């Protein structure tokens, strides 16, 4: 059965703060400092701010303070060394609540009655114990479920620039993320109160607030607990999905703001910087965040991770989107140009990719023609973009018959297939039928990427 320990461990209070700068507090003469320990800085005003030991020396401990170092006095701040890494108290009753960045509740509810104290950093899942997820989720979005299909257990972000409706797309996916009963955990990371209220309103309207736990860290919230928010949200997701055999859909919005928090912390440590000033280990940090998805051999549960991401200047080469593409399994690319043209969702399926569509596509899973239809659509859309560039450069008359057909397909594809209203939930079969109605523009001879056994059966 369950095992637990009624144990009391007295905690050392250190008034020996050496210096404080940025988010870091340096202590002076800690006794046996413990790495990645959690400390409680008692300010002279009496307020208590949690911390986290980032680096230790013979007697020093460079504590990062989650709630900011404003007001910390080198002569009256007392640091209390708890004796263990940051552990969130989880429970099955945590569903349906709202928590701040540091895991404390926001709603008028009480402190979460603990069911287990899980370390937020988690533990590495044995790759031999991971099940390859081959059960597609029908997100309802045509440009996702038809060309960049998501499998239940896949960590696929939403690469969207600043000011694009990535919040609307993610809310839509959360609303209609059934299979071809998802519990949701949300980690707001410096999103403005408008975006957080929109997400909360959508989750309440769609009935999801009964089975979702939000970890709201607004832009007004301190900028260092953005490093605890993804870990808290993901250890809650791991708890629910694995140790309650539940299905979890984690939404880690503003991973760009998470990486900005890492940059702020790293730059105050004077560490050797990577590209754009981000820490060298930011690949490993983003990996520790993202890689907590996927199903497991024993426990019937899945964390379908959808970390919304704000690529600055709408660039993939930027370190945050680049490393997120390296770690995660494909990405959903939201295009500023398409949004300006007025399409919703403004998903550009050319940079978009889903690494598990190759397995969850079809041939008995969803439909026989799914994979070939998706490949044909992607190829003809690339041809359409090339034809549009050629027409813009050297005139539309010079375009060939194939190029003109590609332009017509591009127009009828952006304006009728990608374009779908919010709260529209076309099934994958309806999406494939619309795709075919697009592909019937071409003659059967110019559909080369379609396998003939499916072309002759669906054309």
């Amino acid at each position: 059965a369950v095992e637990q320990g009624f144990n009391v461990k007295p905690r050392l209070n250190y008034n020996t703060v050496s210096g404080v700068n940025g988010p870091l507090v340096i202590l002076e003469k800690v006794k046996f400092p413990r790495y990645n320990e959690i400390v409680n800085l008692t300010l002279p005003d009496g307020t208590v701010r949690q911390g986290q030991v980032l680096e230790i020396r013979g007697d020093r401990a460079i504590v990062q303070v989650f709630e900011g170092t404003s007001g910390i006095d080198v002569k009256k701040t007392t640091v209390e060394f708890t004796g263990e890494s940051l552990r969130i108290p989880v429970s099955e009753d945590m569903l349906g609540r709202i928590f701040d960045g540091s895991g404390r509740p926001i709603d008028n509810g009480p402190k979460v009655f603990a069911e287990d104290y899980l370390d937020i950093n988690g533990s590495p899942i044995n790759p031999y114990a991971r099940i390859y997820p081959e059960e597609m989720i029908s997100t309802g979005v045509s440009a996702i479920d038809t060309m960049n299909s998501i499998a239940r257990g896949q960590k696929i972000p939403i690469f969207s620039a600043s000011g694009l409706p990535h919040n609307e797309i993610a809310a839509q996916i959360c609303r209609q993320a059934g299979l071809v009963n998802f519990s949701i955990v949300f980690a707001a990371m410096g999103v403005n109160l408008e975006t957080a209220r929109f997400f909360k309103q959508d989750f309440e309207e769609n009935g999801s607030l009964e089975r979702t736990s939000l970890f709201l860290n607004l832009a007004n919230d301190p900028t260092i607990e953005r490093i605890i928010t993804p870990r808290l949200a993901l250890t809650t997701a791991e708890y629910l999905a694995y140790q309650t055999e539940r299905h979890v859909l984690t939404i880690l919005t503003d991973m760009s703001s998470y990486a900005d928090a890492l940059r702020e912390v790293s730059a105050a440590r004077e560490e050797v910087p990577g590209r754009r000033g981000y820490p060298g280990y930011m690949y490993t940090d983003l990996s520790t965040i993202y890689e907590r998805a996927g199903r497991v051999e024993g426990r019937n549960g899945s964390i379908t991770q959808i970390p919304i991401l704000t690529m600055p200047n709408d660039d993939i080469t930027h370190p945050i989107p680049d490393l997120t593409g390296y770690i995660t399994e494909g990405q959903i690319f939201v295009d500023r140009q398409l949004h300006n043209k007025g399409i919703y969702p403004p998903i550009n399926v050319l940079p978009s990719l889903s690494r598990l569509m190759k397995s969850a596509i079809g041939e008995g899973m969803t439909r026989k023609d799914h994979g070939d239809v998706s490949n044909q659509l992607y190829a003809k859309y690339a041809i359409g973009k090339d034809a549009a560039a050629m027409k813009a450069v050297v005139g539309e008359e010079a375009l060939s018959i194939e190029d003109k057909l590609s332009l017509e397909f591009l127009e009828k594809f952006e304006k009728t297939f990608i374009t779908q209203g919010a709260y529209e939930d076309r099934t994958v079969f309806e999406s494939l039928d619309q795709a075919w109605s697009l592909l019937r523009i071409y003659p059967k001879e110019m559909l080369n990427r379609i396998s003939p056994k499916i072309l002759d059966e669906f054309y």
Partner: protein, 56 residues
């Protein structure tokens, strides 16, 4: 909208009625196990352990 607004009070009363059983169950559980939990907590708080740091 007026019809929906009128039912809010009835819905609130119905929700309050269903909860009242859970509050009674919580009170009964607390009254039953209060002595045991208090004894365990007191016995843990008193009678301390005394061990130097493992690395010392």
């Amino acid at each position: 909208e007026q019809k929906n607004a009128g039912g809010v009070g009835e819905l609130e009363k119905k929700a309050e009625a269903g909860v009242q059983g859970e509050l009674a169950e919580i009170k009964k559980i607390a009254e039953k196990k209060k002595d045991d939990v208090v004894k365990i907590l007191i016995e843990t708080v008193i009678k301390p352990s005394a061990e130097v740091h493992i690395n010392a």
